[PDB]
Amino acid sequence: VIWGTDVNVAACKENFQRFLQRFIDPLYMQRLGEINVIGEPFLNVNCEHIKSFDKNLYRQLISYPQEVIPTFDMAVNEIFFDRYPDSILEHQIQVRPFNALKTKNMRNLNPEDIDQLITISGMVIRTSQLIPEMQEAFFQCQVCAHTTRVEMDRGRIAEPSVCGRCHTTHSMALIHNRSLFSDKQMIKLQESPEDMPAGQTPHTVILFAHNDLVDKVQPGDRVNVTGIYRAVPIRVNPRVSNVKSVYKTHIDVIHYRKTKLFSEKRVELLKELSRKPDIYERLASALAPSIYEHEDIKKGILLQLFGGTRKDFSHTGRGKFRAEINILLCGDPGTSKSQLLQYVYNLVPRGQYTSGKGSSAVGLTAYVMKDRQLVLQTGALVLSDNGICCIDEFDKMNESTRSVLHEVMEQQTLSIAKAGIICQLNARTSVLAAANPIESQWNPKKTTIENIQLPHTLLSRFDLIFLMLDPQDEAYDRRLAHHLVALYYLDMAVLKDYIAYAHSTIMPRLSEEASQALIEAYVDMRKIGSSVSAYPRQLESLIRLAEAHAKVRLSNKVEAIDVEEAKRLHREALKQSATD
Amino acid sequence: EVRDEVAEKCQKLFLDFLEEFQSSDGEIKYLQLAEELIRPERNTLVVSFVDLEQFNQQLSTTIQEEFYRVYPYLCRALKTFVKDRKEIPLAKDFYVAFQDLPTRHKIRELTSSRIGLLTRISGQVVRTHPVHPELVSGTFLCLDCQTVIRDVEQQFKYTQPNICRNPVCANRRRFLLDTNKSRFVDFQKVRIQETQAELPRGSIPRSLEVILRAEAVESAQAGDKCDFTGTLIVVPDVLSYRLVFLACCVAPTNTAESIKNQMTVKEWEKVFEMSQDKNLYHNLCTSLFPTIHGNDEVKRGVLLMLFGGVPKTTGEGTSLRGDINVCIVGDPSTAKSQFLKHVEEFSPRAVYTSGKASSAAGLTAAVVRDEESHEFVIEAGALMLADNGVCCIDEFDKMDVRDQVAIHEAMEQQTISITKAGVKATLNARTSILAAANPISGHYDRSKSLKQNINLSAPIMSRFDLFFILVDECNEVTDYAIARRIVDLHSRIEESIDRVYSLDDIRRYLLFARQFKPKISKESEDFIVEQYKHLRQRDGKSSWRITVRQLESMIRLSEAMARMHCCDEVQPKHVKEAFRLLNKSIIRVET
Numbered sequence A: 001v002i003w004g005t006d007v008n009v010a011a012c013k014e015n016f017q018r019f020l021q022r023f024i025d026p027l028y029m030q031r032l033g034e035i036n037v038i039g040e041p042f043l044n045v046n047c048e049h050i051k052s053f054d055k056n057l058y059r060q061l062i063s064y065p066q067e068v069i070p071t072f073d074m075a076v077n078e079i080f081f082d083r084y085p086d087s088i089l090e091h092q093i094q095v096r097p098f099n100a101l102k103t104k105n106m107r108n109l110n111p112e113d114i115d116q117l118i119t120i121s122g123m124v125i126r127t128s129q130l131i132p133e134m135q136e137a138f139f140q141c142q143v144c145a146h147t148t149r150v151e152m153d154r155g156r157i158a159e160p161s162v163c164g165r166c167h168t169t170h171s172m173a174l175i176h177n178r179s180l181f182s183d184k185q186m187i188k189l190q191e192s193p194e195d196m197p198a199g200q201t202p203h204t205v206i207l208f209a210h211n212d213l214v215d216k217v218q219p220g221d222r223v224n225v226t227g228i229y230r231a232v233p234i235r236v237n238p239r240v241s242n243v244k245s246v247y248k249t250h251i252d253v254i255h256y257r258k259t260k261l262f263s264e265k266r267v268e269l270l271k272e273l274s275r276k277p278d279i280y281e282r283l284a285s286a287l288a289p290s291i292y293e294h295e296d297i298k299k300g301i302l303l304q305l306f307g308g309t310r311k312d313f314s315h316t317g318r319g320k321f322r323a324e325i326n327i328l329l330c331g332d333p334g335t336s337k338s339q340l341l342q343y344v345y346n347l348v349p350r351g352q353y354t355s356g357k358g359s360s361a362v363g364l365t366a367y368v369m370k371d372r373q374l375v376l377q378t379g380a381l382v383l384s385d386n387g388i389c390c391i392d393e394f395d396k397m398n399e400s401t402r403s404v405l406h407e408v409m410e411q412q413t414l415s416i417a418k419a420g421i422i423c424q425l426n427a428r429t430s431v432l433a434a435a436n437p438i439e440s441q442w443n444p445k446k447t448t449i450e451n452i453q454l455p456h457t458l459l460s461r462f463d464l465i466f467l468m469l470d471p472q473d474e475a476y477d478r479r480l481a482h483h484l485v486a487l488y489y490l491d492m493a494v495l496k497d498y499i500a501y502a503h504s505t506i507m508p509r510l511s512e513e514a515s516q517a518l519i520e521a522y523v524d525m526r527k528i529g530s531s532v533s534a535y536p537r538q539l540e541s542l543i544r545l546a547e548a549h550a551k552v553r554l555s556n557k558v559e560a561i562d563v564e565e566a567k568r569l570h571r572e573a574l575k576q577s578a579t580d
Numbered sequence B: 001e002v003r004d005e006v007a008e009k010c011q012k013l014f015l016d017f018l019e020e021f022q023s024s025d026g027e028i029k030y031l032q033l034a035e036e037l038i039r040p041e042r043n044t045l046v047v048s049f050v051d052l053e054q055f056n057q058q059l060s061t062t063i064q065e066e067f068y069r070v071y072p073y074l075c076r077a078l079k080t081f082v083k084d085r086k087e088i089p090l091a092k093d094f095y096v097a098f099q100d101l102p103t104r105h106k107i108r109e110l111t112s113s114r115i116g117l118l119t120r121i122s123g124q125v126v127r128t129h130p131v132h133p134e135l136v137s138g139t140f141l142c143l144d145c146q147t148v149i150r151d152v153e154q155q156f157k158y159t160q161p162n163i164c165r166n167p168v169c170a171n172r173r174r175f176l177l178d179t180n181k182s183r184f185v186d187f188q189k190v191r192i193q194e195t196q197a198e199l200p201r202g203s204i205p206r207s208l209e210v211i212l213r214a215e216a217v218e219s220a221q222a223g224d225k226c227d228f229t230g231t232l233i234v235v236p237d238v239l240s241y242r243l244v245f246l247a248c249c250v251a252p253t254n255t256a257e258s259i260k261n262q263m264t265v266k267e268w269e270k271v272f273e274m275s276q277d278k279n280l281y282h283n284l285c286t287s288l289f290p291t292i293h294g295n296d297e298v299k300r301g302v303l304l305m306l307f308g309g310v311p312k313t314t315g316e317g318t319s320l321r322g323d324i325n326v327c328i329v330g331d332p333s334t335a336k337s338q339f340l341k342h343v344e345e346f347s348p349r350a351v352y353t354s355g356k357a358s359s360a361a362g363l364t365a366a367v368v369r370d371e372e373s374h375e376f377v378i379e380a381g382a383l384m385l386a387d388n389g390v391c392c393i394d395e396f397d398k399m400d401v402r403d404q405v406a407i408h409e410a411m412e413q414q415t416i417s418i419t420k421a422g423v424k425a426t427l428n429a430r431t432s433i434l435a436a437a438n439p440i441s442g443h444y445d446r447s448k449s450l451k452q453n454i455n456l457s458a459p460i461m462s463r464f465d466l467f468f469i470l471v472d473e474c475n476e477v478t479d480y481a482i483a484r485r486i487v488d489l490h491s492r493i494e495e496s497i498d499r500v501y502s503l504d505d506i507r508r509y510l511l512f513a514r515q516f517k518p519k520i521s522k523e524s525e526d527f528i529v530e531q532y533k534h535l536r537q538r539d540g541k542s543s544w545r546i547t548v549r550q551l552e553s554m555i556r557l558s559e560a561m562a563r564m565h566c567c568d569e570v571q572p573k574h575v576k577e578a579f580r581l582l583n584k585s586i587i588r589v590e591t
Ligand SMILES: Nc1ncnc2c1ncn2[C@@H]1O[C@H](COP(=O)(O)OP(=O)(O)OP(=O)(O)O)[C@@H](O)[C@H]1O
Pocket: A290, A291, A292, A293, A294, A331, A332, A333, A334, A335, A336, A337, A338, A339, A340, A435, A436, A480
């Protein structure tokens, strides 16, 4: 074996080559044929397959990824030289193993894993242009033009300091274009936030895609990356060869995985309780128990959590559809709007919480900034690209930000002219806006637009406008206070699994009953408006609401009961927002 | 005192290619190109890559592999070829511009492996820097020994001499520059990006900086789409490096007969059927707009906008518009954004945007300091990106005053001349514009004039060929039908559309139809004259009056409807329908 390792070149190769041929879910030979057809000279492999096939080889793989991978390529290429023995490829096949040891506690990573393969789930934050790094430096004497080369001089380059032909003084200067280079992309990636128990300080790491696998992950993408953990010294000064005792560390990526659920008991449990007739009401009452007497608001946000069914109108030429639900909560201060947003953001996965003020700690916009490389720092909406962004104090905002909000609500994407190029960052998020009245309290006989002074267009894009206030009813204050004092002296997890399962599995779809019920509801609204009339965006809200209610029922097909509840809840917001 | 025999061999064979290779006629074409190159302002010699491959396939492949290495030798061989041939000025720079390379790569395909070797690429310009003289052969002299360190070529940075020309002296730090003797050449930095076609959906394009020299300096402009032959090269920057593509030649990004021959038989048959197909007008509108109910006049006008009339340049050099400008004013919702989105979705060269767009470009060309270099750069806006295309602008009511006047200048001229901070330039933009707006106070007051209904200035109103008013009718039948269309679309997730003609077939027909230039029959001329007599006799009351601008739109519309059927001449059928569209477009004040 090579020194310091339990690795034999031939035996490991045969064991790996045995794994390629002999396997049970043989797929590796099939994708090899696909590779022989396509020509893509890589073989991405779930390492757990090697674990199931050979735990020792998997253990041997983790211990010595750098040492063992060239043997794996050698085994695969000979297999390619066996099956389809003649072929044409710009270079022979390679292997990019992945999904081996989910040490996803990135914040808990030890130096024991140095030079051992690890896979981690996280969201890429920043990237950069590919760095052309020298591997062979062409040189040529200044005096007599005597050419030469220096090849892979241990990272640094060794200045010849003397010619070869005339052997003059230091005259052999590097030739940039004649030299040999390789691509190297630097990426900075953050720990996956939901995986962090405390999250008091989210962990961040660096990545290096060398000569290949470059630009395959755009910023903000939540992916599982598998690569070799690395640590290198840092010179105290570039001039001096002294180095620090501490060691800055990075990952050399080997594979990118772009991105069942739980045990069978959970799917049994959610399917069980879903059969309850009042599960829709029970979840609403169960959701946000700290709040009291608000149920229409609770039901609305619950439908937003479930969200409308994913729809793909690309075939129709109609573009993407806002399947997500955007609810604006408008009400007096002290009415628990902020608590609800904090509650929903705390419960919801991959969510976001921000403030309508520009002084929000995050900021609801992406922009370029010098690292000193001018790199795009993302925005909260893009950060919650699919999740839910709970925006507090939404009323107070910059008009340009409101313009940005109008775009993403209209298009589910954010267009930014970085430098000169324009990038359309897709943001199919769900917006939970919280707005407070202008002045101390809500003056009646003034619309929400009068009482908030916002564009009628933008709030029209909001499907649901929940108007909540503080009535001058001492009974409600009395019951509320008793409820709070009782609080002074269903678990969320099952609810989160329910929504996660519904998104993972269920997909609402229109029934002709629901279709006709929706049509009757809209024309009825139009007839009511025939005497603020109906708008087809309201129909878009109603169908989207019906999908969420069907998703709550886990029917997988929208039913007229969804339409009736959607019509009811839509009318509630109309009644709440109705004003003369 | 070292010679690269490969470069000597390549230079000789390339010089042989210059002085032996010949056209099909049997004459040395490159002698004729060199003969034309003797003129002032003429230094780049065009060369066909396939020709020198035929002359020597090894020479072409070696040049392809080591293009940067051998390129100075090509210029030197060009100098020997051209100097003796004619009375060329003794020393003016000469360059070789390549072409006929099939290996057209995407920007995604560029790598360190492709450094130095020649390659062709295609993309869209983003921003163009001013021209700047750049030293190529530095002429230096050590202050102490005063020996002239001659012709120290600088690798695109302030590379002083390493050591004195005098072996005795080693001052090593006080090389003064000779301003005149150092060779110079003008370089221009330009940013390009991936074209939309190559670009994956939702993917950020690979921005690329390129250097332009000799005739290539002004070859391309800001915001245009072009193809470039040359090679990629590293450049050191503050052992760091960054990539730039030096393009020797710049070409634009891609006739009816040539298209029809290049068009496959099935595509030819379909397009031939489509040209023969009567009622293609309504059938195309229905196919183009599956998720739409009613408002077919909007669908009609957009389709005419997609085709557009024939442009004309007068004997006085005054350009006359070929495309057109159309606007829509509609109540809240009512599918205007949906209209624009379908148009953008179907059409390449169709760019969507909003008047609320707070970009510094302001939808058009803009002059802005570089974020790093601090020099002003002509950064192209989306309107310039849509050159010879379409712009689906939203929130046209909510435009900015700066954009408003600049846009008004653009549509009036079909071009924009931008001048600020000393920098000056002009750019062509023959782009159909689809304005989307809402009435003032949200809803359209038909009892009030269009000037009251919208905030747009009268020149904007004049320069727009058409205006379509959409109003929320209380008629339940339309409301029921729209809901039926929408719910069927949602319930029938796919297959709800009814595309009698596929969008590719639609696009192929438009491309082939665009190759035609329909003419005005004298029958149609008097027919057009007769139509405007009725319009003039009608005299509105119309929300807007009737100037010659209405007639100009009419003839451009008739040309488009002549282009609809691919007929080389206009007929009265096209004119009367064009009159029907515009005359119906005239909405009278309903007070
Ligand atoms: N209807 C209610 N049911 C239960 N708790 C309520 C209700 N109304 C108010 N509260 C309580 O009142 C307090 C309101 O705090 P919170 O900061 O969430 O209010 P807010 O209305 O969102 O405020 P603001 O608009 O000023 O940011 C919390 O204790 C909330 O529990």
